[PDB]
């Protein structure tokens, strides 16, 4: 009956595939995703979960409202059965914009707001340049949380290095390639600032 925060977190892309191979364009897979919540903001009544589902490349996804969970739960497994298929365009309307109106009314349980200023908080070019000078960027050789793939051994004729059972953080960077890097900042609401 109250407020709503912006999207403060988005999980990495997760692969709906089989434990040993991929899935054809027309096959349904028997998978389930375990969501482990840790140190949630108990002041809120509920925490909501969405799921952006892509069946092709750069296609209109299928957003589903998984559940409206209590904020004190510590685990939820998302079977694909439950969930309402919401419009993908209302993931931009979560929380909404921040405005400075001047007068209000109230009719038919609806609110009007007139003569409003859209409060956009920007970063000064001086601070942007200071951030771009103060950045000590380096390349490191990191890995995944597991870091040991015991599924593969030299006691086999063939082991398929399968990396779809993990997150989309399997991706790395080509050694001789140029990448245009940046950094963002988050407000107290979950609104991400521009890039520096």
């Amino acid at each position: 009956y109250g407020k709503e925060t912006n999207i403060f977190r988005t999980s990495p892309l997760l692969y709906i595939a089989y434990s040993d191979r991929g899935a054809s364009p027309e096959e349904t897979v028997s998978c389930s995703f375990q969501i482990n919540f840790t140190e949630l903001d108990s002041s809120y009544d509920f925490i909501r979960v969405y799921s952006i589902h892509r069946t092709s490349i750069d296609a209109t996804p299928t957003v589903r409202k998984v559940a409206d969970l209590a904020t004190d739960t510590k685990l939820y497994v998302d079977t694909g059965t439950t969930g309402e298929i919401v419009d993908p365009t209302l993931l931009l309307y979560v929380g909404g914009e921040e405005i400075a109106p001047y007068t209000m009314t109230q009719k038919d349980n609806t609110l009007f707001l007139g003569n409003y200023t859209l409060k956009r908080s920007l970063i000064s070019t001086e601070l942007k340049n200071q951030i771009k000078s103060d950045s000590i960027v380096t390349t490191i050789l990191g890995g995944l949380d597991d870091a040991i793939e015991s599924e593969w051994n030299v006691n086999t004729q063939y082991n398929s290095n399968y990396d779809l059972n993990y997150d989309s953080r399997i991706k790395g960077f080509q050694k001789g390639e140029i990448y245009r890097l940046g950094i963002q900042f988050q407000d107290n609401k979950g609104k991400w600032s521009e890039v520096v």
Binding site: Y102, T110, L111, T117
Partner: protein, 236 residues
């Protein structure tokens, strides 16, 4: 790759029809949430004086408060050659918008077909293209109408479907024409009027820094110059 001809010793009948079948979707980026750089020195406006946003009807169920969720998806802009939206008010199931040189009726949730003998925010309906309030705080809502004081026209109006200049009718043109200023109302130093309403006795007080003109709806006549000046608030 979604074919099962992987890691087998036979590999006798394999072919590009069976062996390297591919599902491109897994090669997807984080394209949904994407951003870009902005130029600080660039002038992109953020002020809309002639603009009205509309939220969703409150579900009054166990979900978010629609009022706090502003999407700017049902906007409505009034004429800009009258003036900024000084005040928006509702009287008898209808919203009426005061502008600096205008007064309109925002059609919203009017039944589709006839006014009288579907929640979509239809266009505005202008009542007066030249009369409009300039100090929001001289507006007092009452059963009879909306008492507002227009400094530009030097009058004390009452809207009850039709605009009525109470100052002219009851003879107060000079008093208002001599006590008008451009500076808006603010609590520290009274400069313009500040209208209240006594719901218990149908009395309307148009307060000023050195006087308090009282008006009674019981007789539709001004009563006195009360000694209630310089009071920030008077409410029921």
């Amino acid at each position: 790759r979604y074919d099962k001809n992987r890691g087998q010793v036979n590999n006798l009948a394999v072919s590009p029809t069976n062996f390297n079948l591919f599902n491109p979707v897994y090669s997807q980026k984080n394209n949904f949430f994407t951003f870009r750089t902005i130029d600080y020195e660039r002038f992109s406006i953020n002020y809309f004086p002639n603009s009205i946003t509309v939220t969703k009807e409150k579900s009054l169920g166990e979900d978010i408060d629609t009022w706090t969720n502003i999407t700017l998806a049902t906007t409505l802009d009034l004429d800009g050659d009258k003036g900024e939206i000084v005040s928006l008010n509702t009287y008898n199931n209808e919203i009426f918008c005061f502008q600096r040189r205008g007064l309109s009726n925002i059609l919203f949730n009017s039944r589709v077909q006839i006014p009288t003998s579907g929640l979509k925010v239809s266009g505005k309906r202008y009542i007066s293209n030249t009369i409009g309030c300039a100090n929001k705080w001289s507006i007092a809502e009452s059963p009879s109408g909306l008492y507002f004081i227009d400094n530009e026209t030097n009058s004390l109006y009452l809207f009850n479907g039709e605009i009525v200049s109470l100052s002219d009718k009851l003879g107060f043109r000079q008093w208002i024409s001599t006590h008008n200023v451009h500076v808006n109302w603010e609590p520290v130093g009274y400069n313009n009027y500040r209208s209240f309403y006594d719901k218990n006795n149908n009395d309307v007080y148009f307060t000023y820094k050195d006087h308090c003109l009282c008006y009674s709806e019981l007789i539709n006549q001004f009563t006195s110059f009360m000694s209630y000046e310089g009071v920030p608030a008077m409410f029921n």
